[PDB]
């Protein structure tokens, strides 16, 4: 299988900025390369064929280049409608193979998250399970580290997190993290804490509560 | 919400053509898995020659009806790893196989039974407060959430669901509001899980 590697995985860019993203094949693919664009919640749309030709209707601010193993897609002047995920694909040989995609997002100023922690409800505790939830609200950029500590012991393997898409009006993200324990375990400890490290904060922010 | 199949089971997808001459094009199936990777599934030339990746060879069959203008995907021995959005696509020549993208279909392969969610309050802590609802243990996707029947939209964030190890989904919805209004205002989250015909309302208030 011809491996397609895209770089970078994501990047922030400003309106009007010149943007270039890259795709590398594990071998020569003779310019048999498509580029696709996918907006959140939408079907992909095909922009480029043969590495450098635009499909009918594709805006001229788009262009492609490269040959052999090394290719690129350039947007000469970024518009708001251009945010989304960009994928490459080779059709030189079977099997047809995609790159993992490059995500283009809108650049803005740093914004530190507001952090909230929520204990489990009494109603949930009657089911034998306890969920503790940590909210990071309206921050930028997306990268953040969230740690759970129970009576100050770092937790691992018992949490899941999820993140919103970039907000259409302030370009921030929000993140939810859920710590899940049995009722028995939850009742066996006192201090529950969520600790957040982010570029916009000058020290980690910890929100906590005491069971009871 | 979409087709549901038990592991090992069978399914037939169909894609009816409109707005082009179906018999002129190579037709393909492509899927997008929960981690948003795209993967080629099958192709068939205008004359009926088929092409497959090894991951589905022997399990899936692509076929076409050039008289009724319909594309088919017959799936056998389905695996939980086949869970995805499935797209129909058409192409030809140097455009490639995926020049234009068609009708999508969600396919979920899981042993889980359809189940409505439990809804628990995320209670505002003892000038801005956050509150919400945890929508837990439902199957399949999706659920919808609104606040105060749609009257409250500002500052609302509803997160993507996560798949738990139990095979059931979980998600939270939150909103930020003035602390001042915690006394005078009533905040209710409205949950709808159409696949199980379940509607739940939860009033979220300071403990």
């Amino acid at each position: 299988d011809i491996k397609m590697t895209q770089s970078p995985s994501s990047m922030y860019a400003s309106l009007g900025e010149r943007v270039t993203i890259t795709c590398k094949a594990s071998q020569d693919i003779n310019r048999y390369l498509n580029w696709f664009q996918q907006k959140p919640g939408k079907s992909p749309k095909t922009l480029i064929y043969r590495a450098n030709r635009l499909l009918d209707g594709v805006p001229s601010r788009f262009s492609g280049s490269g040959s052999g193993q090394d290719y690129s897609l350039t947007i000469s002047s970024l518009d708001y409608e251009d945010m989304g995920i960009y994928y490459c694909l080779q059709y030189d040989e079977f099997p047809l193979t995609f790159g993992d995609g490059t995500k283009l997002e809108l650049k803005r100023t740093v914004a530190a998250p507001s952090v909230f922690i929520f204990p489990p409800s009494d109603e949930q505790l009657k089911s034998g399970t306890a969920s503790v939830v940590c909210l990071l609200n309206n921050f930028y950029p997306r990268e953040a580290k969230v740690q759970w500590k129970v009576d100050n012991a770092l937790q691992s393997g018992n949490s899941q997190e999820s993140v919103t898409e970039q907000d259409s009006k302030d370009s921030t993200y929000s993140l939810s993290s859920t710590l899940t324990l049995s009722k028995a375990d939850y009742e066996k400890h006192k201090v529950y804490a969520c600790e957040v490290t982010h570029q916009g904060l000058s020290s980690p922010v910890t929100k906590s509560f005491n069971r009871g | 919400g979409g087709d549901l199949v038990k592991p090992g089971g069978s399914l037939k997808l169909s894609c009816a053509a409109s707005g082009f001459t179906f018999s002129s094009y190579a037709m393909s199936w492509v899927r997008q898995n929960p981690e948003k990777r795209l993967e080629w599934v099958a192709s068939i030339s205008k004359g009926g020659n088929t092409y497959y990746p090894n991951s589905v060879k022997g399990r899936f069959t692509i076929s076409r009806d050039n008289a009724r203008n319909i594309l088919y995907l017959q799936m056998s021995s389905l695996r939980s790893e086949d869970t995805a959005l499935y797209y129909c696509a058409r192409g030809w020549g140097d455009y490639g196989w995926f020049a234009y993208w068609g009708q999508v279909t969600l396919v979920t392969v899981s042993a889980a039974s359809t189940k409505g969610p439990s809804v628990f309050p995320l209670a505002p802590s003892s000038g801005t407060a956050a509150l919400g609802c945890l929508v837990k243990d439902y199957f399949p996707e999706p659920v919808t959430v609104s606040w105060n029947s749609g009257a409250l939209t500002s500052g609302v964030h509803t997160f993507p669901a996560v798949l738990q190890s139990s095979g059931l989904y979980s998600l939270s919805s939150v909103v930020t509001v003035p602390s001042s209004s915690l006394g005078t205002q009533t905040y209710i989250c409205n949950v709808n899980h159409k696949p199980s015909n379940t509607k739940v309302d939860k009033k979220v208030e300071p403990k």
Partner: peptide
């Protein structure tokens, strides 16, 4: 007006 019969993509093997 009606789309003619079109070549299969050139992908090899």
């Amino acid at each position: 007006s009606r789309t003619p019969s079109l070549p299969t993509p050139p992908t090899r093997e």
